[PDB]
């Protein structure tokens, strides 16, 4: 076992000696280290001044580095410090995690408009201060019109986007790499030989496992096409392409030939659906072939590498992707490394509620779907807006109840498939700032439809009290009263134009005029 150095907050400990050490690295995970410390040889008392000074320097949020020669085994921040006392015996345990742990802190909501997944992901890492690279992942260049994170931390949001875009996360100690899972078959290969010479890889204990309880034969993704009013073209995925020979996840025979079908209620273009379908299939088929191999300790192993078994026979020969590497240091066994194959199964964090919203100033819809820009206080606090579809009591081709809400109205916001990216308006409500023209009353006599916008007022009024239905635009009005007359009042002229006019009265017709009655025509025949 080579020299192990442990630097906490830049310096090495003087009172505590490392008894144990275990470092874990995994794909789509936050690497962690566990260190057990203690005072050796009764050099100092545990409650002495020097020992307590080191105790206060090992508090959480301190920086911890584990290094062999120049190679950096681990770099991170202490998250947990534990003390063990039993009689005269004492022991300290430290747990530190990768700087990716900082993505798990916080709980907020924000909106991304006209940004690609690469831009959003790079922004999240920059806030935590993490360098990142992207390899063989062109699918992250697609631009989302509106991407919403709702009441979750950056880690949960990132994990949802990784699956939806079919990408894996390799947590390097200095650089975090995002790569398509199928692109990892071309990585470096560490080969284990059954018939071996004296300089090959020594295998101590091994594990292998083939399962089919969660292996779908096909995955179908279908989406609702708003423009065509039809379900989009179905996309089928039949393979994962991970591994080769007997360690390939595709070599496992499925239970049944059935299909796993998703039919979303929101639009989704063909390219994004294909990546989502592939990400779903890889998620379920990742753990078809799994196992663990324990070898002599070495720092050249990294997650994402290819592990090949050669010469072990027709039942084990193949290749697989190393999804995790663990380093174990102890006095009894020295330095040992464990390699892991497979991964346990895990699109957008969901809304569940009904939300209020404010209709914004008019903006043209980019997709020409007639959506209305609204501001949702919960989903965001910035000046950017969201586009939501409008629900109407009646709507058909070239007809319907078309009363578009004015800017500033309060509306009820619902979401399609509980997705924050697809809001819909279910109705407008009245508030102490937009007074309702009619207040609720004991008798509820009057119903109406007013369009008052200052001094201008146009309405259609149903009144149960006097049993009238009226149309009025300002002072001009037209009233129909049951068991009474039809009254037509105007504050100005009254013009009636028609081809023929037939005014008939069962009792009498009494025309009038205060300054003249001019009866024109070409043949005035009285009788």
């Amino acid at each position: 076992i080579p020299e192990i150095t442990i630097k906490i907050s830049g310096k090495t400990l003087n009172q505590f000696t490392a008894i144990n050490l275990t470092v874990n690295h995994y794909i789509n995970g936050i690497p962690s280290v566990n260190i057990t410390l203690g005072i050796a040889g009764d050099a100092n008392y545990i409650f002495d001044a020097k020992a307590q000074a080191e105790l206060a320097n090992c508090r959480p949020n301190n920086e911890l580095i584990v290094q062999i020669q120049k190679t950096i085994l681990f770099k991170g921040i202490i998250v947990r410090q534990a003390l063990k006392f039993k009689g005269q015996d004492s022991l300290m345990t430290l747990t530190a995690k990768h700087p990716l742990q900082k993505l798990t802190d916080g709980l907020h909501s924000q909106l991304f408009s006209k940004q690609s997944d690469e831009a959003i992901i790079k922004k999240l890492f920059s806030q935590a201060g993490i360098q990142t690279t992207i390899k063989q992942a062109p699918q992250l260049k697609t631009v989302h019109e509106q991407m919403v994170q709702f009441r979750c931390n950056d880690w949960t949001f990132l994990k949802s986007r990784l699956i939806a875009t079919n990408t894996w996360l390799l947590p390097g100690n200095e650089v975090v790499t995002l790569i398509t899972p199928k692109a990892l078959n071309q990585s470096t290969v560490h080969t284990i030989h059954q018939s071996t010479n004296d300089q090959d890889i020594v295998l101590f204990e091994a594990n292998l496992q083939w399962d089919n309880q969660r292996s779908p034969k096909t995955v179908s993704v279908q989406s609702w096409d708003i423009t065509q009013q039809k379900l989009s073209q179905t996309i089928q995925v039949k393979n994962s392409g991970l591994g080769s020979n007997k360690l390939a996840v595709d070599s496992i025979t499925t239970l049944t030939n059935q299909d796993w079908q998703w039919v979303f209620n929101y639009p989704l273009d063909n390219e994004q659906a294909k990546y989502l379908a592939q990400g779903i299939m890889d998620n379920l088929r990742s753990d078809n072939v799994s196992g663990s191999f324990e070898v002599e300790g070495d720092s050249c192993y990294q997650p994402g590498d290819v592990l090949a078994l050669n010469g072990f026979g027709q039942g084990m020969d193949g290749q697989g992707i190393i999804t995790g590497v663990s380093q174990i240091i102890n006095q009894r066994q020295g330095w040992r490394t464990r390699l892991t194959l497979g991964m346990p199964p895990d699109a957008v964090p969901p809304v569940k509620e009904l939300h209020v919203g404010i209709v914004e100033k008019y903006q043209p819809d980019s997709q020409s779907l007639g959506r209305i820009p609204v501001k949702i206080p919960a989903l965001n606090l910035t000046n950017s807006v969201l586009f939501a579809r409008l629900g109407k009591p009646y709507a058909s081709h070239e007809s319907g109840f078309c009363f578009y809400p004015e800017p500033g109205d309060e509306v009820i916001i619902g979401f399609f498939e509980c997705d924050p990216r697809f809001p819909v308006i279910l109705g407008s409500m009245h508030n102490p700032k937009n007074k309702a023209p009619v207040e609720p009353s004991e008798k509820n006599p009057m119903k109406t439809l007013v369009i008052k916008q200052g001094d201008h007022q146009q309405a259609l009024v149903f009144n149960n009290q006097d049993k009238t239905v009226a149309l009025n635009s300002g002072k001009n009005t037209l009233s129909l009263q049951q068991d009474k007359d039809i009254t037509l009042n105007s504050a100005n002229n009254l013009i009636t134009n028609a081809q023929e006019i037939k005014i008939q009265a069962e009792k009498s017709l009494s025309a009038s005029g205060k300054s003249g009655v001019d009866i024109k025509g070409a043949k005035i025949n009285l009788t």
Partner: peptide, 28 residues
Amino acid sequence: PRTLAQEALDNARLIEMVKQEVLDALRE
């Protein structure tokens, strides 16, 4: 397997294997 340092080793090994089986059964 008597003092604190070794008891941490043995119990952690049992914890890791117990946790893996329980998690598999719960997800099953």
